[PDB]
From Swiss-Prot:
Region (Interaction with RELA) residue spans: 37-224
SMART domains: ANK (SM00248)
Protein name, entry field: 26S proteasome non-ATPase regulatory subunit 10
GO molecular function, one term: transcription factor binding
Chief place of localization: cytoplasm
Amino acid sequence: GCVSNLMVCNLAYSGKLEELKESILADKSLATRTDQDSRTALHWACSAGHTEIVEFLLQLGVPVNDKDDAGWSPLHIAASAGRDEIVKALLGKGAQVNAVNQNGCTPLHYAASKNRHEIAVMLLEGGANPDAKDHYEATAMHRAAAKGNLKMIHILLYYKASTNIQDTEGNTPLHLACDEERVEEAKLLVSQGASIYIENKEEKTPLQVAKGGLGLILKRMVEG
């Protein structure tokens, strides 16, 4: 299907390398011409997962941080869509790991929520702020902990992600973890120094928000 009013962007998205090669080399100004979504071939190459095309456009020397008009950089797209090699290639040409789109989200926000284990690691190993806050002041931990992504919580914790940051509703990873009854996720957070005392904008603690025996198994883990 046609995704761009600009030939190069369509060649890039569909995987037409030899044609994009011949095309681009014939007019270098095409590598950076923007389309209706303010996207170059790089953006669409990142979206589809065409690594050889990304690489070619990077050898050429196109910018790697240029945002589309929703604020998505190449790294936002590669990360969100699960393209390990492209993410690697982009970090290899100094891609900004902490760029935020219009929704305030970083690449790591997307890697975290979609369980991009290898990429999360790649972003974090490449200078990602694990404590990056979107517009609701949520972090990767907030998401992973709510969703109950145990493997991702490990990754974030090892890269020194705070466990006691508060979203605008005043909740912490641990609050989400409890409210959604993610049992280990709540144990593991508490083990690593997620407090059971703090309160959200509803005067409530992780223990209260919590349900079941988990509610005070976090109390007989910290206390007694």
